[PDB]
Design a protein around this nucleic acid. Structure first.
Ligand SMILES: [K+]
Ligand SMILES: [K+]
Ligand SMILES: [K+]
Ligand SMILES: [K+]
Ligand SMILES: [K+]
Ligand SMILES: [K+]
Ligand SMILES: [K+]
Ligand SMILES: [K+]
Ligand SMILES: [K+]
Ligand SMILES: [K+]
Ligand SMILES: [K+]
Ligand SMILES: [K+]
Ligand SMILES: [K+]
Ligand SMILES: [K+]
Ligand SMILES: [K+]
Ligand SMILES: [K+]
Ligand SMILES: [Mg+2]
Ligand SMILES: [Mg+2]
Ligand SMILES: [Mg+2]
Ligand SMILES: [Mg+2]
Ligand SMILES: [Mg+2]
Ligand SMILES: [Mg+2]
Ligand SMILES: [Mg+2]
Ligand SMILES: [Mg+2]
Ligand SMILES: [Mg+2]
Ligand SMILES: [Mg+2]
Ligand SMILES: [Mg+2]
Ligand SMILES: [Mg+2]
Ligand SMILES: [Mg+2]
Ligand SMILES: [Mg+2]
Ligand SMILES: [Mg+2]
Ligand SMILES: [Mg+2]
Ligand SMILES: [Mg+2]
Ligand SMILES: [Mg+2]
Ligand SMILES: [Mg+2]
Lengths: 55, 117, 70, 153
RNA sequence: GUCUCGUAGAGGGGGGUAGAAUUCCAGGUGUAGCGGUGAAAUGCGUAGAGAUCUGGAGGAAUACCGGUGGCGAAGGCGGCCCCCUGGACGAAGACUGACGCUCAGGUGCGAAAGCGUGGGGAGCAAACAGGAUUAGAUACCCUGGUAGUCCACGCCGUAAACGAUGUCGACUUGGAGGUUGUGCCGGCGUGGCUUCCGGAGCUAACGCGUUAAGUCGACCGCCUGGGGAGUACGGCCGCA
RNA sequence: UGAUUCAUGACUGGGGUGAAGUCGUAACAAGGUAACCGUAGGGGAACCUGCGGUUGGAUC
């Protein structure tokens, strides 16, 4: 299960600018792509990850 | 009249015009030039060439400041995104950093209605 | 898109890189799409059309590797 | 043409000097197929020009050409919306064809006595960047200058 | 139909919060243009704009993820977090014992616009004004801009409210996918929902084709040449 | 004193038919601003504009 705290893994699924990478490019399953997006959005709110790269 | 050597070039590249503003590192403007004020109106003003002429004139307006190094911030989709940077390097400045700062709303306000031409 | 020109990197090489990082960010396509408002019925109509085109073209490609022209 | 099947035609060199370059200039000057009448006019103007300077008939002719040959011109280009006068590079052959045509046209407009004298005064001013023809080359370079922004259409 | 265990979900109602952007306000730097178009002009600017930096105010919408993806009776539903809450599906069993299907009248829900009262108002923008275009231009284009769009409560009850396809059940060759369960040893099964193609059959043809427009049963709604007309008059409903 | 029904009435509302005069050119092709639906406002007229919706849109 994906953890919003597990920042090291989450960084694999965001671009250099901070955007979530499409599942068609990373080859992620749909059910887990939805968990990644939720986790990434929680991490952004806690300032563990950036919203946009111009931070 | 104070030397700076380390400035920032801001390129405002809209579909109709190009504005080039050179500031120091704290946002204080030192000089500016625009494609529209460099002798081009109408369809000529919105070209990459007119943007290049504006980049040169801006480089001249700040030659007293002794600027040596430049970061470049590009903003907008206009045709003067690249010819202004090419001309800033040909002007003698050392282009240290290039960045896109085009604003993107994360939704934001409703845009104007589509044109029926 | 934050291209830091590294030492000894010629300017043209940095210029082509910044261009690459822009196109890979889709900033230009995103700005052009936000210039005017698109009605939700229009957005849905053109999302469906692009999927019908992606599909019906692949289905004809399969029928073009199993046929001779001469 | 659409099919692009147009090669090149050989032109005989002029009698007195054996220069194909000069023989074309006689052709541009000729009217009604009266070539000998044009050969005489060119030869007379060329001698007045040869004694008005220190150079031979040819070297004085080339110096006249070098000051009238255009390097860039404008051509129209109708694209999605309107038409822009795009500046285009003039190919080396068209440079000579335009230079000769403007000289002959300028000389025909003067008010001296004979055409041999008119051509002589134009070929002489062309050596000093004066008169028409040279001015026509200036007007073309200006137009192509004011449209340099359109140098990619 | 009930119970047990679990699963996915923009299903609903209430509250909170985050970041991007627009506008406005203040200040710093800075100086002659900006903005707009096919080209212009109206408009804005030396009373210092536009550009750039800092701080503040406020409203609305939630980039990427995002998908012929998901959920919902339909209308519809999209940041994140909490609270209240509906449905669906699956695996093993246990339980009730035809408790079912459909439905005139009735009742409820029902996009957008619109209406009432009280709020709110950034952006957008009917009406309106000016600038253009034009033979004219009550338009298309440009610069502005008010209702309205937003919130609470009430009304209205209509849409190409569409799959132009009523609901329920049974039966009848195939192929490739999506999505979500579950059994077994990536491999083999077995459920739910869903996209495209196509067989028989059907169809005026186009096409439909196990999610039927095929083969049947139950019940309901509806049609009967075009125009007049979904109009008049009357009734009921509505503040209009 | 009501109801209902028939006749009639200055004037007025739209409708049909004929005929073609005047004004434009809304639709059919991407019909030259894709068309149409509901609604609202505006306009000599066909109509135009806003908001949501449909494909019964050409091009790509
Ligand atoms: K729930
Ligand atoms: K009923
Ligand atoms: K506006
Ligand atoms: K006209
Ligand atoms: K308003
Ligand atoms: K209504
Ligand atoms: K539909
Ligand atoms: K399945
Ligand atoms: K399975
Ligand atoms: K029914
Ligand atoms: K009212
Ligand atoms: K009566
Ligand atoms: K129309
Ligand atoms: K049409
Ligand atoms: K309408
Ligand atoms: K009128
Ligand atoms: Mg606009
Ligand atoms: Mg509403
Ligand atoms: Mg009203
Ligand atoms: Mg109201
Ligand atoms: Mg109100
Ligand atoms: Mg407007
Ligand atoms: Mg109806
Ligand atoms: Mg609908
Ligand atoms: Mg639909
Ligand atoms: Mg119907
Ligand atoms: Mg089929
Ligand atoms: Mg049928
Ligand atoms: Mg009625
Ligand atoms: Mg009512
Ligand atoms: Mg028309
Ligand atoms: Mg039309
Ligand atoms: Mg109606
Ligand atoms: Mg109007
Ligand atoms: Mg309009």
């Amino acid at each position: 299960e994906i953890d919003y705290k597990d920042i090291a893994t989450l960084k694999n699924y965001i671009t250099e600018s901070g955007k979530i990478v499409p599942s068609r490019i990373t080859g992620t399953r749909a059910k887990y792509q939805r968990q990644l997006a939720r986790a990434i959005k929680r991490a952004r709110y806690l300032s563990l990850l950036p919203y946009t790269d111009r931070h | 009249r104070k030397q700076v050597s380390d400035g920032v070039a801001h390129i405002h590249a809209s579909f109709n015009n190009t504005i080039v503003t050179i500031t120091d590192r704290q946002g204080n403007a030192l000089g500016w030039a625009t494609a529209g004020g460099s002798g081009f109106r109408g369809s000529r003003k919105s070209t990459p060439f007119a943007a290049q002429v504006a980049a040169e004139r801006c480089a001249d307006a700040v030659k007293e400041y002794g600027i040596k190094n430049l970061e470049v911030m590009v903003k907008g989709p206009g045709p003067g995104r690249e010819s202004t940077i090419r001309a800033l390097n040909a002007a003698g400045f050392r282009i240290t950093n290039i960045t896109d700062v085009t604003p993107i709303p994360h939704x934001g306000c409703r845009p104007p209605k589509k044109r029926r031409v | 898109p934050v291209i830091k020109v590294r030492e000894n990197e010629p300017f043209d090489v940095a210029l082509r890189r910044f261009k690459r990082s822009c196109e890979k960010a889709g900033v230009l396509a995103e700005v052009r799409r936000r210039e005017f408002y698109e009605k939700p019925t229009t957005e849905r109509k053109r999302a469906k059309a692009s999927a019908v085109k992606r599909h019906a073209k692949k289905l004809a490609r399969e029928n073009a590797r199993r046929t001779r022209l001469y | 043409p659409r099919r692009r099947v147009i090669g090149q035609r050989k032109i005989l060199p002029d009698p007195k000097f054996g220069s194909e370059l000069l023989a074309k200039f006689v052709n541009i000057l000729m009217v009604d197929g009266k070539k000998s009448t044009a050969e005489s006019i060119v030869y007379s103007a060329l001698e007045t020009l040869a004694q008005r300077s220190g150079k031979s008939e040819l070297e004085a002719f080339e110096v006249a050409l070098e000051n009238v040959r255009p390097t860039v011109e404008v051509k129209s280009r109708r694209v999605g919306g309107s038409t822009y006068q795009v500046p285009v590079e003039v190919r080396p052959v068209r440079r000579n064809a335009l230079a000769m045509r403007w000289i002959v046209e300028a000389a025909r407009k003067r008010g001296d006595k004979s055409m041999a004298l008119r051509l002589a005064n134009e070929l002489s001013d062309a050596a000093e960047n004066k008169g028409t023809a040279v001015k026509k080359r200036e007007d073309v370079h200006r137009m192509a200058e004011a449209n340099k922004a359109f140098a990619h259409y």
